Amino acid sequence: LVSGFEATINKFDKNFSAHLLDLLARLSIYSGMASVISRLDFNGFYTERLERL
Amino acid sequence: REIITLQLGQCGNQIGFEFWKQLCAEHGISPEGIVEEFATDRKDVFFYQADDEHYIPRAVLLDLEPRVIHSILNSPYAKLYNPENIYLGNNWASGFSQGEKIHEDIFDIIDREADGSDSLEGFVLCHSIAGGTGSGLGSYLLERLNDRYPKKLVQTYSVFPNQDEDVVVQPYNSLLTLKRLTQNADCVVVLDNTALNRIATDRLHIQNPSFSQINQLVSTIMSASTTTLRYPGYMNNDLIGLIASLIPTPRLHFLMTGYTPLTTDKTTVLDVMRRLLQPKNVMVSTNHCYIAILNIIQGEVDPTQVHKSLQRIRERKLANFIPWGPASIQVALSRKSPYLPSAHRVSGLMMANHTSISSLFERTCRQYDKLRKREAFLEQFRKEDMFKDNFDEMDTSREIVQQLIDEYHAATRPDYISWG
Amino acid sequence: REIITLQLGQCGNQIGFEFWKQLCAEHGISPEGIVEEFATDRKDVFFYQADDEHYIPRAVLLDLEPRVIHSILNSPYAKLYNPENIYLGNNWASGFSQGEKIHEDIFDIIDREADGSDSLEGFVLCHSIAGGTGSGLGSYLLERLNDRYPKKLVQTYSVFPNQDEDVVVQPYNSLLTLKRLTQNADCVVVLDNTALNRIATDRLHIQNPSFSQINQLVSTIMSASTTTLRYPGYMNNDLIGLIASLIPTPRLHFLMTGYTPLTTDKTTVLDVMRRLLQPKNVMVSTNHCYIAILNIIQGEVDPTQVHKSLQRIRERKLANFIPWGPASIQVALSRKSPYLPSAHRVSGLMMANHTSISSLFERTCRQYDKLRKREAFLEQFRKEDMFKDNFDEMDTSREIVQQLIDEYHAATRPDYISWG
Amino acid sequence: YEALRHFLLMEDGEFAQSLSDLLFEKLGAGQTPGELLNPLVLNSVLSKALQCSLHGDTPHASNLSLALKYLPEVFAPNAPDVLSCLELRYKVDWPLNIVITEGCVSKYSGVFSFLLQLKLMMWALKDVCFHLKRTALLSHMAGSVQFRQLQLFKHEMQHFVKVIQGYIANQILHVTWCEFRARLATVGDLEEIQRAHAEYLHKAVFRGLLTEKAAPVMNVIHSIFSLVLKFRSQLISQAWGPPGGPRGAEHPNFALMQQSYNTFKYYSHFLFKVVTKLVNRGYQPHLEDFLLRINFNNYYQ
16 A cells, blocks of 8 residues: 555556646637636646646 | 434434424425425435325434433424434543443444435434533444444534533543544534634624524534535535545545525625635634635526636635645535525535644644643543543544644645655 | 726825726716616726626725724725725834734735736825825835736825925925835826815815815826726727836836816817916926826817827927927827716826926925934834834935936936936 | 728727737747647637627627738748738628728728737837836846936837827828718718728828838838837847946846947938928828927927
8 A cells, every 4th residue: 555556656647647737738729618727726736837838 | 325314412412403303394394294285306315205205314313311302302393203213421431331331222223224224325423522421422333333334434513612611521522532533434524612603693692592593503504515415416416426525535534614694594606605715604713725625506596607606716716725635626506495485595505624623623632731731630430430540542542633633734734645 | 907006094095985986987887886777998907897797996995093994984885895805103114014014914915806807917006105104004015016026017196295384204204205116116196285285276265175175186187097098099008008108217207297177077189288288287386397298188089180289289389398308298099988977078188207396305305304404303202213223214215315306307407318 | 890990900909909919929939930820829819809809799790800811931030020911801791792892901901910010019118118127126226327228218219119109090090080981971872982981091091101102201110110129129138137336237238239229219310301301392291290290399309
């Protein structure tokens, strides 16, 4: 639970974060329509990690 | 699956009595349990069903040294609540010891209801912290249920007592209750006597009869916290599904309450959310932060505006929280019921995980520590001393609750990824 | 980007209060913030939009030792202004010290509005020079805002007090405020109590209740100065774009005001401009010259004649100026609003950079210098002395304001290309 | 006619400023090799500007389209877009077809081009005032003499571009459109309706100075505008220096800027000569208007 469990958790974490930030950026490019993203992060958690270009 | 409510202790039985009466009036139920002639709701979960739609709730009323349970019996609603499951000190140890001798028969009362229902999800305890007879017995029963039903879940509508600090052994009793609750309770919804009394002074001039009126406030919170289950909706059609978001880590499972029209005796969703995030509505008395927030609105709510309301409330940033948790606030909706007044047509409630309650736990721990150094009230009666000669479960509770305090502040820290 | 107005002090709150009612009546807004049923304007900048048609202004009302803010509360427009952002001596030092302890929560009030808005350009202060509680605190807050928002700009509608010279420490207080304003304020619009009182004697017989009536004059000036922003136009569609022409050099950022129909209760553009350049319409009390002039006209203005009007005003040469700056006067146009009286259908205002205001600064510096030699009211209480034992911030302000005076006269000189 | 006046000829200020503003932010920042010309971004900024105009959302807001004609190989230094062929396209129904002809909208587009480059100028200058306030003299502890000089140099050119924009604004816009509205009331036949709008637009161009016969003044405007753009960019390129004594070295390119300041002033003086040169030869009332706007107060501003 301490070590191998975590070993799976972190690779799942990185993959999910990649698939998540790519999704949010590829949705940010599009211009109610824009109500989605900021609701997905209401707090400003991960408000912006990597600025594209 | 149907929920069974294990109301115990004098105070717990008072609030369970009022809660079931509130759901009698709210649902199509008369004081004799008869389906109302004037009467779209999921009454399966909370009330056992007859085909004439008679609805007795799955209440387990536990009495110890009964005084107010006789008054409960001499009521118009005695015919409403009859699972015929009432089976006959102010110290936690006395309550625990008194519970131990009758544990088998009360547990057979539990078993009968579990068998009777088609199925069982949860045990909802109207528990009283440091409640004399209520505490100790509730802790022992809490320890028994998880062992007997490992898959099943226990929620506790703990009325945490703060009365500006009569019982002299309150910190001792409460400290023990929190140890049992921290390790043996899946969820806890905390309420505060001072917080509700301050709200009482705010909304009304009532000061002296605080307990009698505050029952109504507690009942409104309890009913509103379950309305999304009691009425069909899109999401959160089950208790565990609702609970998951509210409790992100097992240790930090204590939940904050709030209600937008505290004077519920038209307002848009933007307004009710903004009102809701203010502290005067909050019914609970170094940086600090929420871990997660959830809000349920019942009324004439226009649907296109609820997203826009969340967007606006994001611009407002009335609620400040940077926890380890990624949980964002969510706007949920439930159905306002017919037959009761629709005053303040739109009315909402919030359940949240907040680090501030660590302060309240630390206040009773502070009282306990001072009292422990003095040893002014060690109790050490024939019951207290014989049950606990070592008096070391008190220290075990102190270290467990101190772990809880440290865990709360670690959740505030940026690095709760590491052990808390 | 939306503008937030930081109205502070008793006098500042009085004039901001009047200003927002003036824009309530002028725009389609009722006393409860509801869009008027009888109602083409850019209300985005100045009024925050609620979902249910509450146009709530971005006013920050700061009270210290509140007396008139209670009167502000018990008004029909209290529902109009509800961001719920009001948080509880006659000396500059006392005000500065009282502000320093409360700085964080008023600044969190600033932060909340900054977050609530889509975006933020400017902080417009209804500041009172030597305003007892207003001064000192306004200087401290002015020092904080530029640091926290370096990119952003601060304007100050300073009501410079000239009452024929009761407060004995006026020169000291105004001197310190002017140091902070000279180095930490992007723009200042100067108004004069004596000048507006003389206008009051001219237009009406009102002499004794000067402050109550002069509020209206200040409000007309303040609203007219923003009307080009509040209503769409071809140019000066943003505050900074307007400000650039008015302030040519950073130090000399103090702006004189004027209004053609002081008795606004048909006239061609030629007439309104030539009237305006006369000194009676002006509201401010060795060669001397303007640095730059700008005029805005709101009415039924013929388009072909405005440029000919500027031709003809060049023929009149009513405004004499040979500054280092090359900025010539410009004829600008804004929209007269509906629903209010259209009396004096064509009506205009002027904002100008004039060296004459250096005289008004030098008068209070003269009073200060005399008072400083006497040390009659240097002020050295427990608050004053402990806050400033050296009493050398006064001398720092004296040298900074003396630099400002010399810079003004250097701007008059032909060689402001060289250092001023 | 009114909605087309609002959006293509940019009467509603908010629409013009927002549509120009987003495009300018992307234009200066990057995406120069026609990555700002992607159909998605063009359509998105158009829709965003139309929504955020706040003048209103109407059926008339239909038929507005953002498009391009010539394809830029890459945007030039300073991202000038002096001739960026971004065409606002307006569809016309068969009723609005005998009224509006393609040549008429070809003439419409010219003012959008010239007005937009004026907004482009105004943008960068708003931004350098906002940049010197980005500096804020935030180290107010250090008050720099050369800072004092440089804001004066800024004031010069911002007021010049303020006067040029105001000039054309007072020459056309409300002036000719009032005349056109009167003629529109007067016209009572198809041919009459055609010629009223035809001379509305021909007068607008003539007063706009984009007319071919008035090329010289527009050339001097090109030179002045190029100077202002580039030498305003340079101060942004550089950064301030250590606080001590006299400190010109903050943004040390200031010395090259002083030469540039003199060159801009030379074009200004030359323009005061040019306008009079042309007015005396022939008959051009707009040029008389221009020669007094450029210098109102003294022999030279």
